[PDB]
């Protein structure tokens, strides 16, 4: 007798999915929505390459630590790679004010142009040729100082005079700049370097005012210094002018950065991974992803277009039917 039957597809598939009603269900066709593969390296993005701070910290780089000469000058970057146990940062002991807001502001950028903001010329009646210390050595001179700052002291002869400096930002770009205030360990060194008198460091901009006086005290020795420097930063906006004025204890700005900010969003990666000559559209702290998948369980930190991060190990959607072969 003639037979006709109704039925459905099967194959040698063993790929399983889960449902609310049943776990481990074999189906004929499925699709994985989640990526968990990664090249373990850093690649360029928008073909712009990252900035490897190597054996420097952001602090070291942007203050101009002598041992960070490698990084000196102009820099372009798609993102920033800080290695976890980089040793060259703040050589001469002291606190960098608003460090976290600085590390974040720098992140929001993509290029800097180094430029002499205040020539040593600027400061009248003072010795800009000393201002050097073994807490801050180079690789060739075990007594140096930051490349973007000047430690101004009194001349052999005279009195530490009132000193003034001004800079009108006539350019199109905001300027990131730095200064400091020296806090000697005792009165003896205060007098040697800057002289008698109540000393001050004052700064001014259309939008901000800074003022501080030296805080003299011996503090625990760090790199053989029981003195300190309080470091500061700011952003001189386009059109604004900066006025400096002090009668002592000023670590003056010397070089500064013309800062162009990205309206992407940048990133600062603390990692051990190598930087290699490759492109990428998605780069995570733990590696680049190459995929069209919409989910990923690698890492929640990235730049570029990455898939949504989740804690699933698999997200497999069933497309075919139950497999019964």
Ligand X SMILES: *[C@@H]1O[C@H](CO)[C@@H](O)[C@H](O)[C@H]1NC(C)=O
Residues 6+ apart with CB under 8 A from 67: 55, 56, 60, 88, 91, 137, 138, 139
Q: The tokens of 35 are what?
A: 């990526």
Distance, CA of 142 to CA of 223 (rounded, Å)? 12
Considering the rule CB under 8 A, would residue 311 count as an interface residue with other proteins?
yes
Considering the rule CB under 6 A, would residue 19 count as an interface residue with ligand X?
no
Residues 6+ apart with CB under 8 A from 20: none
Considering the rule CB under 6 A, would residue 133 count as an interface residue with ligand SIA?
yes
Residue of the chain from 14, 15, 21, 51 that contacts other proteins (CB under 8 A): 21
In angstroms, give the least distance from the CB of 233 to ligand X.
21
Considering the rule CB under 8 A, would residue 272 count as an interface residue with other proteins?
no
Considering the rule CB under 8 A, would residue 210 count as an interface residue with other proteins?
no
Between 77 and 151, CB nearer to ligand SIA: 151
Considering the rule CB under 8 A, would residue 320 count as an interface residue with other proteins?
yes
Contact between residue 62 and residue 251 where contact means Cβ atoms under 8 Å apart:
no
Considering the rule CB under 6 A, would residue 168 count as an interface residue with ligand X?
yes
Q: Would you say how long the chain is, in residues?
A: 325
Contact between residue 234 and residue 165 where contact means Cβ atoms under 8 Å apart:
no
Q: The tokens of 42 are what?
A: 């850093």
Give the one entry of other proteins, ligand X, a copy of itself, none that residue 161 binds, where binding means its C-beta sits below a cut-off of 5 to 8 angstroms depending on kind.
none
Distance, CA of 141 to CA of 265 (rounded, Å)? 39
Between 37 and 166, CB nearer to a copy of itself: 166
Per-residue binding string, ligand X, 234-253, x by CB under 6 A, is -------x------------
Considering the rule CB under 6 A, would residue 314 count as an interface residue with ligand X?
yes
**Residue found under tokens 């003639």:** 2
Between 46 and 315, CB nearer to ligand X: 315
Q: Which of residues 86-115 bind other proteins (CB under 8 A)?
A: 98-101, 103-105, 107-108
Burial-class residue 210 by CB neighbours within 10 Å (0-12, 13-18, 19+).
middle
Q: Identify the CA nearest to 33 among candidates 314, 320, 325.
A: 314
Distance, CA of 244 to CA of 290 (rounded, Å)? 51
Between 24 and 47, CB nearer to ligand X: 24
In angstroms, give the least distance from the CB of 150 to ligand SIA.
10
Contact between residue 276 and residue 290 where contact means Cβ atoms under 8 Å apart:
no
Distance, CA of 90 to CA of 133 (rounded, Å)? 13
Considering the rule CB under 6 A, would residue 130 count as an interface residue with ligand SIA?
yes
Interstrand relation of 175-183 and 228-236 (parallel, antiparallel or unpaired): antiparallel
**Residue found under tokens 């004929």:** 28
Interstrand relation of 308-309 and 295-296 (parallel, antiparallel or unpaired): parallel
Tell me the number of residues near ligand X by CB under 6 A.
11
Considering the rule CB under 8 A, would residue 273 count as an interface residue with other proteins?
no
Which chain residues interact with a copy of itself by CB under 8 A?
A: 93-95, 166, 183, 200, 202-209, 211, 215-220, 222, 228, 230, 240-243, 245
Between 141 and 221, CB nearer to a copy of itself: 221
Considering the rule CB under 6 A, would residue 290 count as an interface residue with ligand SIA?
no
In degrees, rounded to 5, the angle at the alpha carbon of residue 8 between the alpha carbons of residues 7 and 11 is: 135
**What residues line the site for ligand X (CB under 6 A)?**
11-12, 16, 18, 23-24, 168, 170, 220, 241, 314
**Binding site residues, ligand SIA, CB under 6 A:** 130-135, 143, 151, 153, 184-185, 189, 224-227
List of residues contacting other proteins (CB under 8 A): 1-12, 17-23, 25, 27-28, 31, 33, 98-101, 103-105, 107-108, 235, 265-269, 294-295, 300-302, 305-312, 315-325
């Amino acid at each position: 007798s003639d037979k006709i039957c109704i039925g459905y597809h099967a194959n040698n598939s063993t790929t399983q999915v889960d449902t609310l009603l049943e776990k481990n269900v074999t189906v004929t066709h499925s699709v994985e929505l989640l990526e968990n593969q990664k090249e373990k390296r850093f690649c360029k993005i928008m073909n712009k390459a990252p900035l490897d701070l190597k054996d420097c910290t952001i602090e070291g780089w942007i203050l101009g630590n002598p041992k960070c000469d490698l990084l000196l000058g102009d820099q372009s970057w798609s993102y920033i790679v800080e290695r976890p146990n980089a040793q060259n940062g703040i050589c001469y002991p002291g606190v960098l004010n608003e460090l976290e807001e600085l590390k974040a502001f720098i992140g929001s950028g993509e290029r800097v142009e180094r430029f002499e903001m205040f020539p040593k010329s600027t400061w009248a009646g003072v010795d800009t040729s000393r201002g050097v210390t073994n807490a801050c050595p180079s690789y060739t001179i075990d007594s140096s100082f930051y490349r973007n700052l000047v430690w101004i002291v009194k001349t052999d002869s005279a009195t530490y005079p009132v000193i003034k400096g001004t800079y009108n930002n006539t350019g199109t770009q905001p300027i990131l700049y730095f200064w400091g205030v020296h806090h000697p360990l005792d009165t003896t060194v205060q007098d040697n370097l800057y002289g008698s008198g109540d000393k001050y460091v004052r700064m001014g901009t259309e939008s901000m005012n800074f003022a501080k006086s030296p805080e003299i005290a011996a503090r625990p020795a760090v790199n053989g210094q029981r003195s300190r420097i309080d470091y500061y930063w700011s952003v001189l906006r386009p059109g604004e002018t900066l006025n400096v004025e002090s009668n002592g204890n000023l670590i003056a700005p010397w070089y500064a950065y013309k800062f162009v900010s990205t309206n992407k969003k940048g990133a600062v990666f603390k990692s051990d991974l190598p930087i290699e000559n490759c492109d990428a559209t998605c780069q995570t702290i733990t590696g680049v992803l190459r995929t069209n998948k919409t989910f990923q369980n690698v890492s929640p930190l990235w730049i570029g277009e990455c898939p949504k991060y989740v804690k699933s190990e698999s997200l497999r959607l069933a497309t075919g039917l139950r497999n019964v072969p």
